[PDB]
Amino acid sequence: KQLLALNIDGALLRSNGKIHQATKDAIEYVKKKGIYVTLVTNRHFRSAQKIAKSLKLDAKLITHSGAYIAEKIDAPFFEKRISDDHTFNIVQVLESYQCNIRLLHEKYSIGNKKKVNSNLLGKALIHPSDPIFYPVQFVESLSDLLMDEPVSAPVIEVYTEHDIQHDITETITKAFPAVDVIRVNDEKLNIVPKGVSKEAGLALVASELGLSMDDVVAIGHQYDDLPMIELAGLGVAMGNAVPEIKRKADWVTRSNDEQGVAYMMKEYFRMQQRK
């Protein structure tokens, strides 16, 4: 294998947001062996890049659910975003539902203030804004703000109770042919430009490197990771993934709180040594 692609949340990071020393040591070793290491994430580019900096990756990172692929923010390798007018229209529709909305731009994030009965929203790791490089604000009315401040969003994140996800998904897919809806988990959807995804972004990076998906190890933990797990040469589910995802993977490793990334890569190399 020639390319290792890792989720950040639920894989690289422990549930307290720390990167374990064993994980750092495993990634350093992987790189020393000539394997290209990148991140494949729903996180905004800036958060992903600071993590990459900690791991000394110097790689094209696949961020904003595949909509933004870059090594340095001002000069992306691949970018796609929802038009400002479509973003406004989508926000108006979502405002009629009980859902928390976040426009996840690479330069800032803006969300509404609607409270939802969602525990995964409560569990999700919060990471810093920066008042210059990444302001994060909430407003009571997103669509009112967008009237005078249009936003062209690479990703719109939608948190809800599970009961209405199918309806929101149907309503958006039908009304907006320019976007796709990606189910992340029971309480979170990403709305992205049509054709954008983690697996599509990963394919673009592998192709750029002269590799195929056959040459890729992909490590994921949620529903939106399933396609890259199925399509990669070796698709790995973290121990903290739900049972369905674990059944669908080629390989199940330990959890993100038990250094499952390091554990899996140690075995990958033992396998190499045996062969």
Place this chain on the structure above:
Amino acid sequence: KQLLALNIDGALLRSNGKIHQATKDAIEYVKKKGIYVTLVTNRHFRSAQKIAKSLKLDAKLITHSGAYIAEKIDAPFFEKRISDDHTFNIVQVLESYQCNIRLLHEKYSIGNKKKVNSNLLGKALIHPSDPIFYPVQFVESLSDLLMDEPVSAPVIEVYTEHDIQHDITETITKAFPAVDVIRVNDEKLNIVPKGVSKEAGLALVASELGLSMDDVVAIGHQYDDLPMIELAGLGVAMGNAVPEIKRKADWVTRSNDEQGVAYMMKEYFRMQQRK
């Protein structure tokens, strides 16, 4: 003539920052006659675009001294910026001089806190930051900040007393072949990527429209406007420009506090009617 290009500061705007009703009326008339109206400015893109919105321009605007040409911020027609490493190195050199430095990014601006004996700095119109869309911050040490927060700047603005401009200009030009130094006035320099300028940006826009510089009316007021004044089919100096600029123009109009833009365009049309 087919294309009207206007400065914002010192031309479109009165010295109190207001756009006079006569100016609005003149621009509406120009557009109704089929003439393409755009802005050519040292201002950051966002400030230029809000002004364009007020004038209902819907045009490609030439901003950041020609480094950023766009109708909508996320999707530029033309962009060039100084690399992050060159930006850092340039800032380090400038820090050894008595000068106020501002990194004029399209998403934010960051400057140092050095005080200079400069009245044109005192006179220059301040326009709003926005905590989401355009944060503006000052730090004691720009180069220290850039160590952990690299910036790839379309323009670096440098304010000084007049006595050291030549030395700074020489030092930068010699040390950084990837950039050009543009003298704006006796107390302000812009450092831009090589080949970037107001006149170059204007040429790119005219070419995109199937026009030549011959078809352009350009209205400017400072040293950095001289090339487009000389190169445009009709180059106009505002009344508030210094005498040298007024001598070099084809036509001198009234000042920005006496509606010189409106006054000049009224004559342009009287000329048309006579012909």
